Design an enzyme around this catalytic site. Structure first.
Site, PDB file in Angstrom:
ATOM      1  N   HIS A 152       0.802  -1.225   0.000  1.00 40.60           N
ATOM      2  CA  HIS A 152       0.000   0.000   0.000  1.00 40.60           C
ATOM      3  C   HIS A 152       0.842   1.286   0.000  1.00 40.60           C
ATOM      4  O   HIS A 152       0.250   2.355  -0.091  1.00 40.60           O
ATOM      5  CB  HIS A 152      -1.087   0.028   1.074  1.00 40.60           C
ATOM      6  CG  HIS A 152      -0.601   0.141   2.474  1.00 40.60           C
ATOM      7  ND1 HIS A 152      -0.633  -0.940   3.329  1.00 40.60           N
ATOM      8  CD2 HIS A 152      -0.162   1.225   3.153  1.00 40.60           C
ATOM      9  CE1 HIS A 152      -0.184  -0.490   4.488  1.00 40.60           C
ATOM     10  NE2 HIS A 152       0.105   0.808   4.431  1.00 40.60           N
ATOM     11  N   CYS A 206       3.579   1.314   9.334  1.00 38.66           N
ATOM     12  CA  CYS A 206       3.456   0.187   8.417  1.00 38.66           C
ATOM     13  C   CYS A 206       4.825  -0.236   7.885  1.00 38.66           C
ATOM     14  O   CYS A 206       5.715   0.609   7.692  1.00 38.66           O
ATOM     15  CB  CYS A 206       2.468   0.492   7.301  1.00 38.66           C
ATOM     16  SG  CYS A 206       0.832   0.973   7.906  1.00 38.66           S
ATOM     17  N   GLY A 245       2.366   5.640   9.769  1.00 36.77           N
ATOM     18  CA  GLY A 245       3.793   5.658   9.496  1.00 36.77           C
ATOM     19  C   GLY A 245       4.502   4.405   9.994  1.00 36.77           C
ATOM     20  O   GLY A 245       5.642   4.153   9.610  1.00 36.77           O
TER      21      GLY A 245
END
Ligand SMILES: Cc1ccncc1-n1ccn(-c2cccc(Cl)c2)c1=O
Ligand SMILES: Cc1ccncc1-n1ccn(-c2cccc(Cl)c2)c1=O
Lengths: 304, 304
Positions: free
Chosen positions: B41, B145, B143
């Site tokens: 993503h 991820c 942030g």
């Protein structure tokens, strides 16, 4: 979202751990620049544990009796000195992995991470608080002496604790990095009173703010209190008296949530007087005091 | 003595963290050998978050659109590929700090450490369990991820988790290092059912053994039970059914303490039916399920 008992990343500290052996005792040392710091009881044998004469014991040792190994490589000891309850072994090689560091003496109620080590090798990392009575409730077995506590601010490691002893009660005691014990403890195998401990009020309030930020809000009520009234409750429940200095340190959390510090004190007063009624706050069924207001802000804002 | 929610030392993992930017999104990547792994993503914008067509979004990106920075140094991307929900960015330089590692898919109920990171920089480390419903209760902000979960066996890091998402309920979801989600989750900004969770029975029993080893024994009783009887209680209290495989894994702890597994089950049955009566076990006022029997043995024996 979510709130966890988070420790600092241990990498910078792992690179400083060494094994120190003197005679038949092996423990951990901290190698910073060209000095290795370790608990002075590495020079003891079982017979001199009840009351070691450290000055006399150290006089029987020479530089070559201190075996210092950093992983697989042996360090050459060119000097030794005792400072309070720590030994400083000067080595001929500066640790190439020495981070930017400071030695600090932390206050009771402050938190830090511990890198538990055995034979100079890291085993695990956990966050804990220095109790108001200057003990820590850690996880340490024989061989863990010399493991250190620290905090990290950007690239600087502030070493605040070195592990020396487990009291007969199963709680832990140690020194700052200049070898001064936190609390009344002495490095002898003797029963030693730790003194009355208390719950760190400012930390429980900070954790209640962390709870509201993360969505646990059932404990918020329609009440308020005063510092005087709250402190009568804190006295009854063996909590540290709250001061304006603590209220001031909670300022950022009070601003972020819009909950006045004395309003949060009224919620804490109700939880002290009524209990949790079988409910939880941030996955805990008790009032947590191992997060400072600084810890809460850091974790809730993602500081690296 | 003492028992703590201990994480693995994070150093070997800190040396693998990089920042990955694609367009306007920045998250963390894991640099092992000459490949950087990150959540797919990273290629999304806000408009394509409800249901991204990842294949189409990735077709608009070239190697030069993936900005990968390891601290201050920029890595040159010479290839990119999507494997399930992860992107693999081939770089021209092997990470000099790559530890010995494996990619593993952990089972529900198993534990691991998470190194929470932001902008490729480590923020903190904590231990958690993969819930029976394949979610984790972590501490992650926007942030984070690309932060990873792992276990360490001597010098080998087994990476088991990469963080991708926070569900609307505040719990976390992610993938193995081949990009396969744990659980039924999809990498879309949509409400997703996590399914009924349960308490990890074998872990609560392991933690009760850790309690007895460390001196908390008030919960030991004069009773015993059977797997059948205990499982009727586990059903009523939303606990995982205990099997002979779980009894077998608790063997070492039962041998160390001399407490038969079904006798410990009778203590757990009484705590489930009666509660803790305002008492604590290992500093907890609830039944803890984030320590596996392996965790207990490791912590109680000082494995490094
Ligand atoms: C056995 C153990 C377990 C956990 N932490 C530490 C220990 N541990 C190992 C040695 N000592 C010790 C006790 C009193 C005085 C002195 Cl000089 C040393 C101790 O307490
Ligand atoms: C905001 C946040 C906080 C903690 N962990 C993660 C996040 N976080 C950041 C992006 N996403 C996200 C949500 C659904 C689908 C996809 Cl492809 C990405 C998310 O959950």
């Amino acid at each position: 979202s979510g709130f966890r008992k988070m420790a600092f990343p241990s990498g910078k500290v792992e690179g400083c751990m060494v094994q120190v052996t003197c005679g038949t005792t092996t423990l951990n040392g901290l190698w910073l620049d060209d000095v290795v710091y370790c608990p002075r009881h590495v020079i003891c044998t079982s017979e001199d544990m009840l009351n070691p004469n450290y000055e006399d014991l150290l006089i029987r040792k020479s530089n070559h009796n201190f075996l210092v190994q950093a992983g697989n490589v042996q360090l050459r000891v060119i000097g030794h000195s005792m400072q309070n309850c720590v030994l400083k072994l000067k080595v001929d090689t500066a640790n190439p992995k020495t981070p930017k560091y400071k030695f600090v003496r932390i206050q009771p109620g402050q938190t830090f991470s511990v890198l538990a080590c055995y034979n100079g090798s890291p085993s695990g990392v956990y966050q804990c608080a220095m109790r108001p009575n200057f003990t820590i409730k850690g996880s340490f077995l024989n061989g863990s002496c010399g493991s250190v506590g620290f905090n990290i601010d950007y690239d600087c490691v502030s070493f605040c604790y070195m592990h020396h002893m487990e009291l007969p009660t199963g709680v832990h005691a140690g020194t700052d990095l200049e070898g001064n014990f936190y609390g009344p403890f002495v490095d002898r195998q003797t029963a030693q009173a730790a003194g009355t401990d208390t719950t760190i009020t400012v930390n429980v309030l900070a954790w209640l703010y962390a709870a509201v930020i993360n969505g646990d809000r059932w404990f918020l009520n329609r009440f308020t209190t005063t510092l005087n009234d709250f402190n009568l409750v804190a006295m009854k429940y063996n909590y540290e008296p709250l001061t304006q200095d603590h209220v001031d340190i909670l300022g950022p959390l009070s601003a972020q949530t819009g909950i006045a510090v004395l309003d949060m004190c009224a919620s804490l007063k109700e939880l002290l007087q009524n209990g949790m009624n079988g409910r939880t706050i941030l996955g805990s069924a008790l009032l947590e005091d191992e997060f400072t207001p600084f810890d809460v802000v850091r974790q809730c804002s993602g500081v690296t």
